[PDB]
Write a protein that holds these residues in place. Sequence first.
Motif, PDB file in Angstrom:
ATOM      1  N   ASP A  23       4.872  69.998  45.277  1.00  0.00           N
ATOM      2  CA  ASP A  23       3.992  70.148  43.923  1.00  0.00           C
ATOM      3  C   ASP A  23       2.818  69.393  44.251  1.00  0.00           C
ATOM      4  O   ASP A  23       2.758  68.458  44.821  1.00  0.00           O
ATOM      5  CB  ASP A  23       4.798  69.992  42.855  1.00  0.00           C
ATOM      6  N   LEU A  24       1.790  69.914  43.361  1.00  0.00           N
ATOM      7  CA  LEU A  24       0.343  69.279  43.283  1.00  0.00           C
ATOM      8  C   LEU A  24       0.227  68.914  42.000  1.00  0.00           C
ATOM      9  O   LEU A  24       0.253  69.646  41.107  1.00  0.00           O
ATOM     10  CB  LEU A  24      -0.580  70.229  44.037  1.00  0.00           C
ATOM     11  N   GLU A  25      -0.487  67.627  41.864  1.00  0.00           N
ATOM     12  CA  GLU A  25      -0.991  67.245  40.415  1.00  0.00           C
ATOM     13  C   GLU A  25      -2.444  67.908  40.160  1.00  0.00           C
ATOM     14  O   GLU A  25      -3.248  67.505  41.164  1.00  0.00           O
ATOM     15  CB  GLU A  25      -0.862  65.710  40.507  1.00  0.00           C
ATOM     16  N   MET A  26      -2.771  68.073  38.927  1.00  0.00           N
ATOM     17  CA  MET A  26      -4.067  68.342  38.741  1.00  0.00           C
ATOM     18  C   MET A  26      -4.071  68.205  36.873  1.00  0.00           C
ATOM     19  O   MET A  26      -3.319  68.042  36.316  1.00  0.00           O
ATOM     20  CB  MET A  26      -4.346  69.986  38.592  1.00  0.00           C
ATOM     21  N   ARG A  27      -5.512  67.982  36.736  1.00  0.00           N
ATOM     22  CA  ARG A  27      -5.840  67.480  35.450  1.00  0.00           C
ATOM     23  C   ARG A  27      -7.027  68.761  34.913  1.00  0.00           C
ATOM     24  O   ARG A  27      -7.706  69.311  35.247  1.00  0.00           O
ATOM     25  CB  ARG A  27      -6.640  66.060  35.301  1.00  0.00           C
ATOM     26  N   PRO A  28      -6.938  68.844  33.441  1.00  0.00           N
ATOM     27  CA  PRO A  28      -7.751  69.736  32.756  1.00  0.00           C
ATOM     28  C   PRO A  28      -9.314  69.366  32.717  1.00  0.00           C
ATOM     29  O   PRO A  28      -9.772  68.407  32.096  1.00  0.00           O
ATOM     30  CB  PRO A  28      -7.240  69.514  31.282  1.00  0.00           C
ATOM     31  N   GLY A  29      -9.912  69.839  33.835  1.00  0.00           N
ATOM     32  CA  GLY A  29     -11.339  69.560  34.102  1.00  0.00           C
ATOM     33  C   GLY A  29     -11.726  69.277  35.485  1.00  0.00           C
ATOM     34  O   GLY A  29     -12.869  68.856  35.817  1.00  0.00           O
ATOM     35  N   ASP A  30     -10.708  69.416  36.271  1.00  0.00           N
ATOM     36  CA  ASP A  30     -10.884  69.357  37.775  1.00  0.00           C
ATOM     37  C   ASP A  30     -11.262  70.781  38.589  1.00  0.00           C
ATOM     38  O   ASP A  30     -11.086  71.555  37.923  1.00  0.00           O
ATOM     39  CB  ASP A  30      -9.849  68.707  38.458  1.00  0.00           C
ATOM     40  N   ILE A  31     -11.928  70.484  39.850  1.00  0.00           N
ATOM     41  CA  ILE A  31     -12.129  71.797  40.648  1.00  0.00           C
ATOM     42  C   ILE A  31     -11.289  71.689  41.553  1.00  0.00           C
ATOM     43  O   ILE A  31     -11.060  70.959  42.574  1.00  0.00           O
ATOM     44  CB  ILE A  31     -13.437  71.322  41.181  1.00  0.00           C
ATOM     45  N   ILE A  32     -10.403  72.924  42.007  1.00  0.00           N
ATOM     46  CA  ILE A  32      -9.293  72.970  42.897  1.00  0.00           C
ATOM     47  C   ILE A  32     -10.070  74.174  43.830  1.00  0.00           C
ATOM     48  O   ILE A  32     -10.363  75.310  43.243  1.00  0.00           O
ATOM     49  CB  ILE A  32      -8.159  73.536  42.164  1.00  0.00           C
ATOM     50  N   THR A  33      -9.688  73.999  45.017  1.00  0.00           N
ATOM     51  CA  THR A  33     -10.169  74.906  46.152  1.00  0.00           C
ATOM     52  C   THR A  33      -9.023  75.704  46.635  1.00  0.00           C
ATOM     53  O   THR A  33      -8.249  75.278  47.412  1.00  0.00           O
ATOM     54  CB  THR A  33     -10.865  74.209  47.354  1.00  0.00           C
ATOM     55  N   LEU A  34      -8.973  76.956  46.168  1.00  0.00           N
ATOM     56  CA  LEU A  34      -7.955  77.997  46.368  1.00  0.00           C
ATOM     57  C   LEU A  34      -7.951  78.361  47.844  1.00  0.00           C
ATOM     58  O   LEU A  34      -9.189  78.856  48.270  1.00  0.00           O
ATOM     59  CB  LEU A  34      -8.025  79.268  45.783  1.00  0.00           C
ATOM     60  N   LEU A  35      -6.890  77.863  48.809  1.00  0.00           N
ATOM     61  CA  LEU A  35      -6.844  78.208  50.026  1.00  0.00           C
ATOM     62  C   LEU A  35      -5.936  79.382  50.374  1.00  0.00           C
ATOM     63  O   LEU A  35      -6.508  80.095  51.138  1.00  0.00           O
ATOM     64  CB  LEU A  35      -6.421  76.802  50.843  1.00  0.00           C
ATOM     65  N   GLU A  36      -4.820  79.192  49.710  1.00  0.00           N
ATOM     66  CA  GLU A  36      -3.743  80.199  49.948  1.00  0.00           C
ATOM     67  C   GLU A  36      -3.547  80.921  48.742  1.00  0.00           C
ATOM     68  O   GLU A  36      -3.187  80.558  47.748  1.00  0.00           O
ATOM     69  CB  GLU A  36      -2.504  79.823  50.758  1.00  0.00           C
ATOM     70  N   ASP A  37      -3.734  82.656  48.875  1.00  0.00           N
ATOM     71  CA  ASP A  37      -3.736  83.157  47.526  1.00  0.00           C
ATOM     72  C   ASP A  37      -2.740  84.576  47.981  1.00  0.00           C
ATOM     73  O   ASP A  37      -2.914  85.536  47.564  1.00  0.00           O
ATOM     74  CB  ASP A  37      -4.716  83.649  47.251  1.00  0.00           C
ATOM     75  N   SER A  38      -1.698  84.136  48.801  1.00  0.00           N
ATOM     76  CA  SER A  38      -0.873  85.298  49.160  1.00  0.00           C
ATOM     77  C   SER A  38       0.126  85.644  48.216  1.00  0.00           C
ATOM     78  O   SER A  38       0.603  86.822  47.993  1.00  0.00           O
ATOM     79  CB  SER A  38       0.022  84.957  50.548  1.00  0.00           C
TER      80      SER A  38
END
Length: 68
Positions: A23-38
């Motif tokens: 799993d990956l950790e993320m916070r409200p206000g960060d920018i994530i780079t979508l790599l896999e959208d299968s």
Amino acid sequence: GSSGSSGNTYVALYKFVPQENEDLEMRPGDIITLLEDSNEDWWKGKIQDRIGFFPANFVQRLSGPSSG
């Protein structure tokens, strides 16, 4: 991204709590780079110093600056 193809950015709406490395950790206000959208339910991306899988219902595809 060398000769990137799909440059879709997503902004985490809420903070995620990964139970396992997978799993990956993320916070409200960060920018994530979508790599896999299968998949459809959950998508995979790349964070500054974080990486892994995450739910889509948590992020919101960034369309762009809406204007006339």
